[PDB]
Amino acid sequence: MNPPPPETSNPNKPKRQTNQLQYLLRVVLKTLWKHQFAWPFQQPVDAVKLNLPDYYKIIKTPMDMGTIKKRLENNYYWNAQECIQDFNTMFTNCYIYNKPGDDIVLMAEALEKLFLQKINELPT
Ligand SMILES: CN1Cc2ccccc2NC1=O
Predict the structure, then answer these.
(1) Mutation test of ligand 1: which of 42, 52, 67, 93 has the most ligand atoms closer than 8 Å to its C-beta?
(2) CA distances (Å), 40 to each of 29, 80, 97, 107, 108, in order?
(3) CA 94 to CA 60: how far, in whole Å?
């Protein structure tokens, strides 16, 4: 079964807009999104559709780029580091659930390298 997806808004959490967060949406996320290996990460893992019935028995902090994108669009984050942590959670979940060498892991590894390339330098 699938749990509810992660929240993309929270009225009691303070919002913020920063040059770095704008950049994470306009450049980092929106560029990764177009990568040929982006598709598995563009929405929450669907344990039913993908036939991964144990996914959420194993992964307790789900994250995906669809969620991140919505969060950025909503100014959900306080700062860039909070957003970067979501990306890292997404990649880490993939390495936890799957094994080295798996096609999905090769896709995550590629995206993570591109992600690190693009956040190496952020605006000030
Ligand atoms: C995050 N995904 C996405 C996915 C899509 C299709 C088949 C397998 C997976 N495994 C994952 O861990």
Answers:
(1) 52
(2) 14, 23, 14, 9, 9
(3) 12
CA of 43 to the centre of ligand 1 (A): 10
Q: Return the structure tokens found at 124.
A: 């000030």
Per residue in 37-46, is it b (16+ CB within 10 Å) or e — as a string? bbebbeebbe
- Map out the domains of the chain with their CATH numbers: 18-122 (1.20.920.10)
User: If DSSP codes are grouped into helix, strand and coil, which group holds residue 67?
Assistant: helix
**What's the start-to-end Cα distance of the chain, in Å?**
43
Ligand 1 binding pocket includes 65 (Cβ within 6 Å): no
- Say how many residues make up the chain: 124
Resolution of the coordinates, Å = 1.5
CA 90 – ligand 1 centroid, Å: 11
Q: Is 55's C-beta closer than 6 angstroms to any atom of ligand 1?
A: no
Are the beta carbons of 64 and 90 closer than 8 angstroms? yes
Structure determined via: X-ray
Task: Decide whether any atom of ligand 1 lies within 6 Å of the 97 Cβ.
Answer: yes
